[PDB]
Amino acid sequence: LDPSGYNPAKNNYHPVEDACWKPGQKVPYLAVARTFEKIEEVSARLRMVETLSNLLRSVVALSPPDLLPVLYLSLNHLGPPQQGLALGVGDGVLLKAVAQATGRQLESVRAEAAEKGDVGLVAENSRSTQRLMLPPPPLTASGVFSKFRDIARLTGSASTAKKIDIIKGLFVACRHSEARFIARSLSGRLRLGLAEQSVLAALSQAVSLTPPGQEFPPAMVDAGKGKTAEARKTWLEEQGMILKQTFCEVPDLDRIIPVLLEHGLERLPEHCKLSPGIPLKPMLAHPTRGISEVLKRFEEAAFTCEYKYDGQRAQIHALEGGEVKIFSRNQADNTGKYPDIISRIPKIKLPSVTSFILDTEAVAWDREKKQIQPFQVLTTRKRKEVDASEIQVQVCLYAFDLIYLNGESLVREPLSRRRQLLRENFVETEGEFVFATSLDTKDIEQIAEFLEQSVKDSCEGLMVKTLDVDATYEIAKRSHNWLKLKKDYLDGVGDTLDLVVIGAYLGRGKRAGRYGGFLLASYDEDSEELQAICKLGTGFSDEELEEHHQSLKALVLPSPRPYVRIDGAVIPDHWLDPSAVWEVKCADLSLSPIYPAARGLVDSDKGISLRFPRFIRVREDKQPEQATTSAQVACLYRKQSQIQNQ
DNA sequence: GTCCGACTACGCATCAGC
DNA sequence: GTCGGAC
Ligand SMILES: *OP(=O)(O)OC[C@H]1O[C@@H](n2cnc3c(N)ncnc32)[C@H](O)[C@@H]1O
Numbered sequence: 001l002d003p004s005g006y007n008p009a010k011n012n013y014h015p016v017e018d019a020c021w022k023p024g025q026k027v028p029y030l031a032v033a034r035t036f037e038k039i040e041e042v043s044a045r046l047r048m049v050e051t052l053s054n055l056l057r058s059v060v061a062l063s064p065p066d067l068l069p070v071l072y073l074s075l076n077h078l079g080p081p082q083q084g085l086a087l088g089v090g091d092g093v094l095l096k097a098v099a100q101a102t103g104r105q106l107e108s109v110r111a112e113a114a115e116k117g118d119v120g121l122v123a124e125n126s127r128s129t130q131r132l133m134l135p136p137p138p139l140t141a142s143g144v145f146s147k148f149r150d151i152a153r154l155t156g157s158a159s160t161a162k163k164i165d166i167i168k169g170l171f172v173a174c175r176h177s178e179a180r181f182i183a184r185s186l187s188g189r190l191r192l193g194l195a196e197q198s199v200l201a202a203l204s205q206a207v208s209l210t211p212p213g214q215e216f217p218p219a220m221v222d223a224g225k226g227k228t229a230e231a232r233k234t235w236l237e238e239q240g241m242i243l244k245q246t247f248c249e250v251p252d253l254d255r256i257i258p259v260l261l262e263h264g265l266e267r268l269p270e271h272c273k274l275s276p277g278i279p280l281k282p283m284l285a286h287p288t289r290g291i292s293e294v295l296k297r298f299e300e301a302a303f304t305c306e307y308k309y310d311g312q313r314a315q316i317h318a319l320e321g322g323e324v325k326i327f328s329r330n331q332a333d334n335t336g337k338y339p340d341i342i343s344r345i346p347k348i349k350l351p352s353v354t355s356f357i358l359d360t361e362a363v364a365w366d367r368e369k370k371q372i373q374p375f376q377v378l379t380t381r382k383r384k385e386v387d388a389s390e391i392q393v394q395v396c397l398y399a400f401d402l403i404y405l406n407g408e409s410l411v412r413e414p415l416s417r418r419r420q421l422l423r424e425n426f427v428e429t430e431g432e433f434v435f436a437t438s439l440d441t442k443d444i445e446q447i448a449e450f451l452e453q454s455v456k457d458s459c460e461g462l463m464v465k466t467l468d469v470d471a472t473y474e475i476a477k478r479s480h481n482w483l484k485l486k487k488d489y490l491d492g493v494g495d496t497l498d499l500v501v502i503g504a505y506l507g508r509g510k511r512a513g514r515y516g517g518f519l520l521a522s523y524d525e526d527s528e529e530l531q532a533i534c535k536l537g538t539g540f541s542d543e544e545l546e547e548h549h550q551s552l553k554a555l556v557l558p559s560p561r562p563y564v565r566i567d568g569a570v571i572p573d574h575w576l577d578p579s580a581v582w583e584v585k586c587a588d589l590s591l592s593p594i595y596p597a598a599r600g601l602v603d604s605d606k607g608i609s610l611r612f613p614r615f616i617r618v619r620e621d622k623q624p625e626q627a628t629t630s631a632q633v634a635c636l637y638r639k640q641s642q643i644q645n646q
Numbered sequence: 647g648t649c650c651g652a653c654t655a656c657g658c659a660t661c662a663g664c
Numbered sequence: 665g666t667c668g669g670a671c
Contacts, residue, residue: 043670044671045648045650159661160662197649197650287666375656379656383657383659508652509651510650510652534654534655535654535655538652538665538666539667587665587666590656610655611654611656611665
C-alpha cells in the first residue's frame with residue numbers, strides 16, 4: 001500500500017489489513033509521521049493513545065524488531081537516560097542544515113522559523129532542491145533512529161559539519177510530512193501533545209489487544225472482542241499498571257521491550273524488578289499553596305514534615321558486590337561526579353548492610369563554618385572525571401527515603417517502615433551524612449514554626465508525606481504523592497518585585513504568533529538607567545498573554561532607548577518603550593554573571609537576577625520611575641537567610 | 647487531578663573561528 | 665524549576 005494514505009486513527013483499525021507495509025519489512029518513517037499527524041490533530045489524550053496503540057499494534061504484528069525505535073521516536077528519546085546520549089545540535093545548526101537542504105539563505109529560514117515558531121513548518125514547505133535529483137530511497141523508522149544516534153555520537157573538532165551533513169541527508173530523503181517531524185525532533189520540540197505517560201498507555205494497550213510472540217498471520221489481533229465496555233476498561237488499566245509500575249522500577253526500554261516481546265506483559269515483573277545499579281524513577285512532589293491545603297488532600301491521615309534542602313537529588317545504589325553508583329533525578333549517571341561520596345559510603349551504614357538504594361539530597365557544605373551553602377555554590381563542582389583530591393566544594397548528604405535494603409525491595413512498604421529501616425541501619429555523621437530534619441505532628445502552629453525554622457536553617461520550605469495511608473514508593477499509582485510547601489507559594493511572603501518591561505521575545509509552539517517571553521529591568525537611580533534583571537515567561541494566562549501582545553506591540557522600538565542596559569542578556573526580538581510595570585514574584589535572588597541589575601552594590605563584577613520569576617499582575621498605577629530600584633534589589637538579596645548565614 | 651508543553655537562572659563542558 | 669490549558 002501507500003504510506004502516504006496511512007490512517008492509524010480510523011474506526012475499526014486492523015493491525016494487518018490497515019497497515020502500509022508488508023510483514024518482515026522495516027516500518028516506513030512516513031507511517032510514523034502519519035501517526036504523528038493524527039496525534040497532533042486531536043486534543044483528547046484517549047484519542048491520542050488509541051492512534052499510537054494502533055501503530056504499535058501493526059508493528060508488534062508485522063515488524064517486531066522495529067518496536068524499540070518507533071517507541072523512542074514517539075518519545076523523542078535517543079535511548080536510556082543513564083547512557084547520556086545527547087544530540088549536540090543547536091537551533092542555529094539545525095537552521096543552517098535546513099537552509100542548505102532547501103537551497104535558501106540562512107536569514108530567510110531564520111526569519112520564517114521565528115515568525116512561525118516552528119522549524120518543522122519551514123523545513124517541510126521548502127523543496128526547491130527536491131526537483132533537482134531523483135527521489136532517494138524512502139526513510140525507515142529504524143534508519144531514521146540510527147541516524148539520530150549517529151548525530152549524537154559525533155564528537156570533537158569539525159563534528160558540527162558532520163552533524164549537518166547527516167541532517168541534510170535526512171531532509172533530502174524526506175517526503176510529505178517527514179521533514180516537519182524530523183526537524184521538530186532535532187530541535188527537541190516534537191509538539192505532539194503525547195509523551196511518556198501516554199506512550200506507556202499506548203504500549204500496554206497495543207500488546208494487550210495484539211499480543212506479541214505470535215505466528216503470522218496473527219491468531220489474535222484484538223483480545224478485547226468478546227468483552228463489555230466496563231470489562232475491557234478495567235482489563236486495560238490492570239495491564240497498563242503492570243507496565244507502568246515496572247517502568248518506574250526500570251525506566252529502560254532497552255531492557256523492557258526485549259523481555260516484553262518474549263514473555264509478554266504478564267511475566268514482565270518477574271524479569272524486570274528493582275535492583276541496585278539500575279536507576280529508578282524518583283518520587284515527585286505536588287506544590288501546595290498553604291498549610292490548610294495540606295490538611296485537605298491528606299484528610300485524616302497522619303503525615304510527617306521534613307526540611308526541603310536546596311541541593312541536587314542523589315539516588316545512591318550500593319550493590320551486593322560493594323560497587324557504588326549514584327544517579328540524578330533524570331536517571332543520569334552521577335557516579336564520577338561525587339568521588340568524595342564514594343569514599344564515605346563505609347561511614348554511613350552498619351556492618352550488617354549488604355545492599356541498599358538511598359534517596360538523598362546532595363547539599364554543598366562549608367566545613368570551616370559548619371553551615372549549608374546555597375545551590376549556586378553546589379553547581380560550581382565538576383561534572384565528570386573528578387578526582388577526590390581536587391574536590392573544592394564539599395557535599396553533605398541528607399537522606400530522606402530508603403528503597404532497597406539487603407536484597408529486598410521496600411517499594412510497596414509504607415513510609416513509616418522505610419523511615420524506620422533507614423534509621424536503624426544508618427549512622428549520623430554530621431556535615432557528611434545526616435537525616436532530614438523531621439517533625440511528625442498535626443498542629444498548625446507547630447507546622448508554621450517548622451516552616452519558618454527551615455528557611456532560617458538555609459532551606460526552601462517543607463516536604464509533607466503521609467506515613468501509613470497511601471505512603472508507598474509506587475510512582476505508577478501517583479507520581480506526585482508528596483507535597484511541597486514553600487514560602488513563595490503563600491500570597492503574603494512579600495518577595496514581589498515591580499519591574500519594567502523593556503523587551504519581548506517571539507514565542508514558539510504553544511506561543512507561536514505572540515510573545516513567549518519578556519525582558520524585565522530595574523531602575524538604577526544613581527546611573528539613571530534601567531538595568532535588565534531577568535526574563536519572564538510564566539505566570540500569564542492565555543488571555544493575558546494576548547492582551548500583553550496587543551498592548552505592547554504599539555511600544556515596539558527599532559532600537560533600544562539610550563538609558564537601557566542589558567549587558568550580556570539575550571538581545572530581545574522586539575525592543576519596547578519602557579512604560580509597562582508588572583508585579584513579579586520569585587523564590588530567591590541570585591548573583592548573576594550576565595544581568596547588570598544592581599551590579600556593584602553587592603558584588604564588584606556581578607549583578608543580581610531572580611530565581612524562578614513568575615508574573616502576578618500588571619501595575620497600572622505605576623510608571624517606570626516608581627518601579628523597584630536596584631538599591632531595593634541589593635537589599636532584598638542581602639536579607640536572604642542563606643546570604644545572612646554567611 | 648493528570649498529563650503535557652509553554653517558559654525561568656546558572657555554570658560546567660564543548661567547539662567554531664581565528 | 666513555575667505555570668496554565670484541555671480533558
Ligand atoms: O521543587 P522540587 O520538585 O524540586 O522539590 C523536590 C525535590 O526537592 C529535593 N528535596 C529536598 N529535601 C527533600 C526531602 N526532605 N524529601 C524529598 N525531597 C527533598 C529533592 O531533590 C526532590 O526531588
